[PDB]
Amino acid sequence: MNKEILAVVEAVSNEKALPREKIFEALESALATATKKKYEQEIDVRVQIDRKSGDFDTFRRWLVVDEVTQPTKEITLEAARYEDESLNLGDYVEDQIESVTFDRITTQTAKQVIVQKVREAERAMVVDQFREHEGEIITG
Amino acid sequence: HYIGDLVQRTEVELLKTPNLGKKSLTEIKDVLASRGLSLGMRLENWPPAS
Amino acid sequence: MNLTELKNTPVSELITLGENMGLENLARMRKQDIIFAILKQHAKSGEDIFGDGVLEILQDGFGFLRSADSSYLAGPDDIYVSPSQIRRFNLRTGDTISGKIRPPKEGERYFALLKVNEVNFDKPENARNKILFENLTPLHANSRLRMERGNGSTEDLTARVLDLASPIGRGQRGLIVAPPKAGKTMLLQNIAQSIAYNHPDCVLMVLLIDERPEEVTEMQRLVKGEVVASTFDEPASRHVQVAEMVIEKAKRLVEHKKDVIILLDSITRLARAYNTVVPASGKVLTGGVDANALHRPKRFFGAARNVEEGGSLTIIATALIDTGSKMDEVIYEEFKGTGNMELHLSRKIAEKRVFPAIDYNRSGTRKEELLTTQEELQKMWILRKIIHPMGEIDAMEFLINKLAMTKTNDDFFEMMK
Amino acid sequence: MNLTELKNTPVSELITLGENMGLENLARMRKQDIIFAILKQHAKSGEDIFGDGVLEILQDGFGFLRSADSSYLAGPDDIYVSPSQIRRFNLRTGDTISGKIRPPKEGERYFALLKVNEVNFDKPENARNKILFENLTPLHANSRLRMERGNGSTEDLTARVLDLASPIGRGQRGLIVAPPKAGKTMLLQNIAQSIAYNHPDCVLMVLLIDERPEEVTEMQRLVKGEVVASTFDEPASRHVQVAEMVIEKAKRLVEHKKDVIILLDSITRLARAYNTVVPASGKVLTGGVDANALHRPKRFFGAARNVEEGGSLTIIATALIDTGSKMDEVIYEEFKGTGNMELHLSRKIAEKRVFPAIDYNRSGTRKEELLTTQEELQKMWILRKIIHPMGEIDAMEFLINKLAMTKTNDDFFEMMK
């Protein structure tokens, strides 16, 4: 449940080397990958776990283009009269809600992608904090 | 009724039809285009021969 | 249907409308619940909705269009709009928007806007080409807001006396310094009535913050225009919410070249609210007040200015003194000289139970030759010189008698010559 | 049998009734346990029960009908009702319901309602068609609640003095500002007696919050009607429970077009209770008080209003000052000007041991021309002008002598002419 999400966001070792915002961004990516692996069709989703006030809620991104391949993530650039879009690009929907984020394969892919994201963020931060000293002699 | 009467119809003529919201439209677009084809095409050989 | 025609009607009208719609017994739900049910029943027949709401944004990205029924709070009648519309039509908080809306669709629970029609009573063309508020250049007031009605009834005194005590101009920064139970309520009622009669073009705005519901209803049935209010049935959250809503509405209006005149009462309660909501920054001074907590009231009093090309934002806020709260004392101290107009009411004269009770020597306006003409200014100088040596109760009785034998200010002027 | 006839009788009556029922020695159990056993014995003969209880709902969905014996708390005598009945008959908290009930059946442990008979002393027809409380429109009081008894005994002074100090109206928002050990207990006793004698139609209500049992029993045997109380034998939970129960009961009554007059004492203890129960929101101000914890007392003081078509809800709450608790100070500060009626009692006059001890210059009523007639208002003005220059002890002795030579207020009026 979301109490487990709070426990894992407050139980990190590098608490500020990976802020809560980026924690939940990586967790949203995890849940999106899990929901992608759930359905046989490919459909991009956003989570918005509601860091402090509430739980998560999956969505359904359209990636508005004039193509039709896998129409789960296809919609024309002019479909804006019904379903209340009034849009040209960026039309995304919020159709599917309340996916499962605690089963076996979901937990596995979440752990894997969280490890990947934390190692990437730590490396990027430890390199960027020294990038300001470019063109200098450093020990080590 | 026939599938050929639906493949020659862009989705613009679906969301305007009543009782075609999110679940119905999503189910249609999933179970129609997953078979290789898509929704909305231009052809003239229809219906042979009925 | 339109939402405003469900807005202006009382509860019994909604009852009979729901009975027309063949609805269940609806006397138990909120007015907004009844409006929601009636709109759903109307759209079930295949109908669209027309709505109007002031826009508000949180950090969540999307916007909410609130109505004045709940004094701009969350409710089943407010409209939900996506951040895409805010990005496209260049929307922001306080921008009142009217247009086509639909009931919540499958899985939704609040209304959604379809097509914008009036952005602050303006087409989106010039609404997108809006000058920024803080990017403007403040000025001073030459347009004199005449407080005299001309009818000369029994209470009009309290208005006409200002015509010789504190001149009012468009965009003036005015503050009232008064003890409780002195007559400020009827005073602001009078000022609202007078500005609406003499200047009906400028949109009227009155701020009822941290007040009793009886005053709320008495002022919502006496002001000559749309009003907002806020009682103490909710904590300081509602107070700060309505303060931001009204300040952004006034900012968007004056950016649309409008003349806004806000009447705030009382400002000490707004300061208490802003203190209660804002967490302590680790430093507190005497009075149990945080240092930078008064930043929001400061800003709210600083929003008053005079636009160069057109429009103005006048703010007339009342402050509470002599309450015994040293906190309040310090608050007034912070508001010592931040405004260029002071209206000083004293409990000593009000205890003699004559109204109004003006502190002529203590009240005044800075840089007042730019407001009125030269002869009026010279006569104001003459009246000030005549009223300075005498006290306050005798001076008040003198002014009351002089403005009681006469009706318009020219008679008193020539009588003072 | 009826439950109320087991309600109004003391413990010895229940003892002899159980002895009539051939029951075991029952002197050891609670009164409610005795009532439960007697009702079970009566229904074992094939009998139905008649009960009456104020309704309360939790988030659990189902409702409980409490009696006034435990001041509306859980007990073996309260009735359990399913959410189905609340959904059908449009029930809500505070709605007192009387009707047929049965003892708990096989596996049950509390009573269950069979058929509703009186919903707030009304048929379910108009009870389901009840106007909402917050949807009403507040007003001000013209119906003057005469505090004078007319008998003119030794203590009636404390009532008649109010007839010249603080006028009372239906739906008035009144608050007492008084130090401890000054005479508020007998004051509210007097006010209750006077309103019951002069206006027996309006249902009387008195709030005893955080008090001693001796005062509880003395007030439950002197008020001229049903009363509620709450001592400190339980934590703030019981206090907030009885506060919600009484406020919803008054709301349902005034929705049924009733005239409710609640007397609360003391309000600082209610504030302490609401502070103790409500968790900290992460921000505390001076005095160890949470910011939005006072929201519930605020609301409770804001419930007072005047209904347009009929009925009113007057609230007269006492506050404690001069106790040395700075917390209490801040509390009173929050209650500076929230009410339109102030009754100021001072310890300085009470130390001279004359009763009552009225702060005439500090007490008063806002917008009082709408309460009484014109001549009475002019005489009130004359009395205020006569009492302003003099002090407080001399003024109190003067008023006592003037109302001691005379009995009705007309004599003092003409004597002041």
Ligand SMILES: Nc1ncnc2c1ncn2[C@@H]1O[C@H](COP(=O)(O)OP(=O)(O)O)[C@@H](O)[C@H]1O
């Ligand atoms: N212009 C006036 N004419 C007659 N009575 C007045 C006037 N102004 C104030 N009053 C008196 O003031 C009282 C109400 O004052 P109130 O509105 O409570 O003052 P405040 O709003 O400062 O607390 C009324 O009883 C009314 O008689």
Ligand SMILES: Nc1ncnc2c1ncn2[C@@H]1O[C@H](COP(=O)(O)OP(=O)(O)O)[C@@H](O)[C@H]1O
């Ligand atoms: N009007 C009065 N007539 C007679 N005795 C009074 C009157 N007012 C106060 N007293 C006496 O003063 C005492 C008041 O104490 P108490 O009522 O406990 O304090 P508080 O006024 O704070 O409730 C009582 O013992 C009562 O006998």
Ligand code: BEF
């Ligand atoms: F109207 Be009072 F000054 F609270």
Ligand code: BEF
């Ligand atoms: F009853 Be006293 F005021 F403690």
Ligand SMILES: [Mg+2]
């Ligand atoms: Mg007032």
Ligand SMILES: [Mg+2]
């Ligand atoms: Mg007492």
